[PDB]
Swiss-Prot record, chain B:
GO MF terms held by the record: RNA binding; structural constituent of ribosome
Subcellular localization(s) per the UniProt record: Mitochondrion
Assembly with partners or alone: Component of the mitochondrial ribosome large subunit (39S) which comprises a 16S rRNA and about 50 distinct proteins.
Stated name of the protein: Large ribosomal subunit protein uL24m
Keywords carried by this UniProt record: Mitochondrion, Phosphoprotein, Ribonucleoprotein, Ribosomal protein, Transit peptide
Species per Swiss-Prot/TrEMBL record: Mus musculus
UniProt KW Nuclease keyword: no
UniProtKB/Swiss-Prot annotation, chain C:
Protein family according to the UniProt entry: Belongs to the mitochondrion-specific ribosomal protein mL45 family.
Keyword Ribosomal protein: yes
Subunit structure, as described in the record: Component of the mitochondrial ribosome large subunit (39S) which comprises a 16S rRNA and about 50 distinct proteins.
Role played: Component of the mitochondrial large ribosomal subunit (mt-LSU). Within the mitochondrial ribosomes, required to direct the nascent polypeptide toward the tunnel exit and position the exit at a distance from the membrane surface.
UniProt GO molecular function: structural constituent of ribosome
Protein name: Large ribosomal subunit protein mL45
Compartments, record wording: Mitochondrion
Gene that this sequence comes from: Mrpl45
Source organism per UniProt: Mus musculus (Mouse)
Biological processes per GO annotation: mitochondrial translation
Keyword annotations from UniProtKB, A to Z: Mitochondrion, Ribonucleoprotein, Ribosomal protein, Transit peptide
UniProtKB/Swiss-Prot annotation, chain E:
UniProtKB keywords: Apoptosis, Cell cycle, Mitochondrion, Ribonucleoprotein, Ribosomal protein, Transit peptide
Designated name of the protein: Large ribosomal subunit protein mL41
Species of origin: Mus musculus (Mouse)
UniProt keyword Methyltransferase present: no
Quaternary assembly: Component of the mitochondrial ribosome large subunit (39S) which comprises a 16S rRNA and about 50 distinct proteins. Interacts with BCL2.
Compartments reported by the entry: Mitochondrion
Highest taxon, organism lineage: Eukaryota
Molecular function GO labels: structural constituent of ribosome
GO biological process, alphabetically ordered: apoptotic process; mitochondrial translation; translation
Range covered out of full length: 40 to 135 of 135
UniProtKB/Swiss-Prot annotation, chain G:
Function (record text): Acts as a negative regulator of G1 to S cell cycle phase progression by inhibiting cyclin-dependent kinases. Inhibitory effects are additive with GADD45 proteins but also occur in the absence of GADD45 proteins. Acts as a repressor of the orphan nuclear receptor NR4A1 by inhibiting AB domain-mediated transcriptional activity. May be involved in the hormone-mediated regulation of NR4A1 transcriptional activity. May play a role in mitochondrial protein synthesis.
Included range, full protein: 25 to 56 of 222
Annotated protein name in UniProt: Large ribosomal subunit protein mL64
Domain of life: Eukaryota
Species classification: Eukaryota, Metazoa, Chordata, Craniata, Vertebrata
Organism in which the protein naturally occurs: Mus musculus (Mouse)
Family per similarity comment: Belongs to the mitochondrion-specific ribosomal protein mL64 family.
Length: 125, 198, 204, 176, 96, 93, 32
RNA sequence: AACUAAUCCUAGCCCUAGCCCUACAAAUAUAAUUAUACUAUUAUAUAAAUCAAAACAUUUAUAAAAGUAUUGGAGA
């Protein structure tokens, strides 16, 4: 869940459960060379690496061994016609290593007449 | 933004209406939804234009410019496939017709009779001729996308017809979250401490 | 929107010696089995379409279309011919002046074969003497003679959209018989370039 | 599963993938609360897979097959949320009568404007929270000049739009 | 989690959201719907409709029988307080 | 300078329209109405100059008094400053 | 065209409304 | 018939009239826009001067009666 308030927890409170998840993630081909088990993911900035582990393990039943995440700064050099800087949306790249000996490789998605020139050929005259 | 024959947002439209355009505004007389009487598929007679006096069926209506498009009428000639290798082939290209340039046709008598909007027993609004009052029923036109709802066959990720129409909701004094707990039987005895909202 | 279709539904095969040649008219009667059912389809929408009288109406359109070229009457020519015919006629005549005239027809025009949601296509046989002279932008003569008649035999196909209430007979294409003589040569001279080769490559 | 993040292998390389219309609000209302919760995940799973494919398409600089599929899913998800929210909203009014899920009230800011203030959760009461008391909900005396400007500005706005309308009217007279 | 004194992170299990994933087996609803299926006119649910569907039948039966009193409003489904429920309608105590 | 290469759009004026044709009617209200209503009473315009005329300073001063209670603070202050400059020029030079 | 009706001043007694803020004080005096 | 250039009409405004007004989520005064404790929380005296009196000093405006009676380095 993103862009929402989570209930404040105090001693003796229930466990926090998100019945419906607003986090949306996309699998991306690794730009750098990574181990085959390692997988790159683009996730919302408010999601934690633990949430991704729970997200994959619960929603997709994918076993995860290790996770490494980075935040990419979006370029703001670009400017519009009005001279207002345009900022690329910042995104987080998550390197997820599979567990149970599983291996991953990015799927291969998207597998007139020449003798008489200048006179229209229509003329027979 | 001046609306044109090209669909808004197209590459040609961007050239036609750049953000920095400051040309003299074009005047289009505002027409109310009740006032407007021209719809796609309606047989109308061109009051004025290149093909004035020829009855045709509407195929596109740009209400922003009060333009009615008749296929094969008010039609000019242009080259299709004009390229370096080939000279090109003439084609017939339609030009926009303003709303006042066409009038609806009475089916019984083929004439450009002025019409007035009025409801029917079924409740559907129908245009009625001011003179020789008659009911001009709404014409039947195929869906623009070409998809016939009945002919459509479910593909992958598409529910069957019966499944979608099934009603399972049972009115009760419980929210979705509570209902999900009841079905799944989640049990939690902890309770949040008081929170001072302010 | 298209009011004509490129190509010919059924290509009529001209027989050698037809120029020398009642007679051929009976051959259509013999071949009415192939064409009369097509003739009925044109007749159904029109009912006045007859192979005997059609050529006169078609001939006027053919002659008129050529006349528009002399006056560059593009607007008029569009009505006379179908959209397929127009690009061929006028594109190569840009920035050129042509004097075209029609000498008396050698033989009467006769319908030859017809084969049409419905575009009736009628093949017509025409032999006529004409005069042609084309000049450059500067007025220099580049093709044809101003006042010399050339006898030309060709088969002309007209096409009308039967379904449309506004459909009319407009010239669509010309069928050229193989036995027809070659066209006159151009006054100017052309050069066929030699093979183009890179510095590494050598002439062969 | 990882396969769920990607489209059907058969569909890969196809110009489009056949898909139907999005779920309408009325149909979702007929569905039960438990059914609505399940459908949200089903739509979400399809949405994520389409997002994954679209991102790869952008990287490959290739067109996305049947982009309307994502739009249909998003519309269905939005329809689901409101239908569920409608049931939540109706019950909240019945049991409590509060027109908003979050406690709030109308308060005056330091600029003299009246704005709805959404209450925040705190572990201590307001009087024991100095920082909350530090927050200013009162207007300074100098705002009186601003209040007059706001009334004048509102009057000025009416004049400007009328002037703008007059210029548009010139087009009507000029064109006709 | 919570950052306590000495700059030490201590994760709190309760504050960590847990994704409750429903079982999609046996569920007949899919992301898209047939073009063959007619669309339903939108009828947003309101408190009047919710009360009529759920609460009205009980009171109507009770009113005819005469077994109705003000003290037993909770009997027909009124909640005196939202405390004790995991999901509280107001103030909202659960995430989307 | 360079001048237009096209003529301005033609203008057609109706000299017998209701406004022009009936302009001035009832201007003799006083003599033809027994002088019950003075022709100055037929003046339409700003309130402070209906039936009255004066120089700009008098007009501005009369405007301030007539709608001073309805004048904007910004406008009233600006008018006072302008009047101050006008007063010195007329009454001292 | 026909000229509009001549302007006429309303005759007869007219009583100003005392409660109205706009009405001047002197118009509400006994002298009035 | 030439390059540089030039050509255009509304973008809009101005003055009166009329009219008082009562037009998403998330985050925020802490370090504003930082989802929860810290640290209590708070504007403003005649308006003056410039200016006029050719400097400068008291002084210097901000319906008719009438610019009259009066006031004033009796001077602006």
């Amino acid at each position: 869940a993103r862009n929402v308030l989570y209930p404040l927890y105090q001693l003796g409170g229930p466990q926090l459960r998100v019945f419906r998840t607003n986090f949306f993630i996309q699998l991306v081909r690794p730009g750098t060379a990574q181990p085959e088990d390692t997988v790159q993911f683009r996730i919302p900035m408010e999601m934690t690496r633990v949430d991704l582990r729970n997200y994959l393990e619960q929603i997709y039943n994918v076993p995860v061994a290790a996770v490494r995440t980075r935040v990419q700064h979006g370029s703001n050099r670009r400017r519009d016609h009005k001279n207002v800087r345009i900022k690329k949306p910042d995104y987080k790249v998550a390197y997820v290593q599979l567990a149970h000996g599983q291996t991953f490789t990015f799927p291969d998605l998207f597998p007139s007449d020449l003798r008489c020139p200048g006179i229209p050929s229509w003329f027979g005259l | 933004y001046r609306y044109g024959m090209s669909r808004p947002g197209s590459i040609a439209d961007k050239r036609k209406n750049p953000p920095w355009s400051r040309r003299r505004p074009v005047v289009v007389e505002p027409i109310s939804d009740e006032d407007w009487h021209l719809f796609c598929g309606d047989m109308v007679e061109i009051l004025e234009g290149k093909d004035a006096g020829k009855q045709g069926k509407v195929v596109q209506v740009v209400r922003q410019r009060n333009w009615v498009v008749l296929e094969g009428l008010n039609t000019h000639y242009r080259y299709i496939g004009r390229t370096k290798d080939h000279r090109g082939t003439m084609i017939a290209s339609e030009a926009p017709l303003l709303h006042h340039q066409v009038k609806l046709v009475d089916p019984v008598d083929r004439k450009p009779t002025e019409i007035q909007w009025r409801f029917t027993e079924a409740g559907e609004r129908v245009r009625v001729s001011t003179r020789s009052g008659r009911i001009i029923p709404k014409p039947e036109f195929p869906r623009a996308d070409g998809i016939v709802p009945e002919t459509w066959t479910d593909g992958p990720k598409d529910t069957s017809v019966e499944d979608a129409l099934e009603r399972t909701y049972v009115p009760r004094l419980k929210t979705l979250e509570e209902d999900v707990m009841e079905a799944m039987g989640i049990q939690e005895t902890r309770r949040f401490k008081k929170v001072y909202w302010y | 929107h298209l009011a004509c279709t490129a190509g010919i539904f059924d290509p009529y095969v001209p027989p050698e010696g037809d120029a020398r040649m009642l007679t051929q008219r009976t051959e259509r009667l013999r071949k009415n089995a192939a064409s009369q059912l097509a003739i009925r389809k044109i007749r159904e929408f029109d009912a006045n379409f007859k192979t005997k009288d059609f050529p006169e109406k078609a001939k006027d359109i053919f002659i008129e279309a050529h006349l528009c070229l002399n006056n560059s009457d593009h607007d008029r020519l569009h009505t006379l011919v179908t959209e397929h015919c127009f690009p061929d006629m006028v594109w190569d005549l840009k920035y050129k002046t042509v004097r075209w005239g029609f000498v008396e027809s050698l033989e009467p025009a006769q319908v030859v074969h017809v084969r049409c949601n419905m575009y009736g296509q009628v093949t017509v046989r025409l032999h006529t003497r004409q005069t042609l002279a084309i000049y450059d932008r500067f007025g220099r003569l580049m093709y044809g003679q101003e006042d010399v008649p050339k006898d030309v035999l060709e088969y002309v196909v007209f096409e009308r959209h039967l379904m449309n209430p506004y459909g009319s007979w407009r010239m669509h294409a010309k069928i050229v018989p193989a036995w027809a003589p070659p066209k006159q040569p151009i006054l100017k001279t052309l050069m066929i370039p030699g093979p183009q080769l890179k510095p590494w490559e050598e002439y062969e | 599963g990882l396969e769920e993040f990607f489209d059907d292998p058969k569909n890969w390389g196809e110009e489009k993938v056949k898909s139907g219309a999005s779920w309408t609000c009325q149909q979702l209302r007929n569905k039960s609360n438990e059914d609505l919760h399940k459908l949200w995940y089903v739509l979400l799973k399809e949405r994520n897979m389409l997002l994954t494919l679209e991102q790869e398409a952008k990287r490959q600089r290739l067109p996305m097959p049947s982009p309307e599929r994502l739009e249909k899913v998003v519309d269905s998800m939005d329809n689901v949320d409101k239908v569920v929210q409608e049931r939540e909203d109706a019950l909240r009014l019945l049991q409590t009568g509060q027109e908003k899920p979050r406690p709030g009230a109308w308060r005056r800011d330091i600029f003299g404007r009246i704005v709805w203030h959404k209450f925040k959760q705190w572990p201590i009461p307001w009087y024991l929270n100095k920082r909350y008391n530090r927050r200013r909900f009162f207007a300074m005396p100098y705002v009186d000049r601003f209040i007059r400007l706001r009334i004048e500005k509102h009057a000025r706005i009416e004049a400007r739009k009328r002037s703008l309308q007059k210029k548009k009217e010139k087009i009507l007279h000029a064109k006709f | 989690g919570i950052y306590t004194s000495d700059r030490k992170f201590v994760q709190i299990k309760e504050m960590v959201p847990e994704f409750v994933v429903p079982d999609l087996t046996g569920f007949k609803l899919k992301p898209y719907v047939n073009y063959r299926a007619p669309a339903g006119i939108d009828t947003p649910l309101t408190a009047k409709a919710l009360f009529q569907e759920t609460v009205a039948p009980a009171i109507e039966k009770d009113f005819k029988e005469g077994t109705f009193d003000a003290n037993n409003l909770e009997k027909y489904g009124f909640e005196p307080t939202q405390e004790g429920k995991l999901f509280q309608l107001y103030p909202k105590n659960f995430p989307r | 300078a360079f001048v237009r290469l096209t003529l301005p759009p033609p203008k057609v004026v109706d000299r017998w329209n209701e406004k022009r044709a009936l302009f001035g009617v009832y201007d003799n209200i006083g003599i033809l109405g027994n002088f019950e209503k003075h022709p100055k009473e037929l003046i339409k315009g700003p309130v402070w100059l209906r039936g009255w005329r004066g120089n700009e300073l008098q007009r501005c001063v009369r405007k301030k008094k007539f709608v001073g209670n309805r004048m904007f603070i910004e406008d009233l202050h600006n008018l006072n400053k302008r009047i101050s400059y006008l007063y010195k020029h007329f009454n001292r030079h | 065209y026909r000229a509009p009706p001549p302007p006429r001043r309303r005759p007869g007694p007219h009583s100003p409304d005392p409660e109205n803020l706009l009405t001047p004080r002197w118009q509400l005096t006994p002298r009035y």
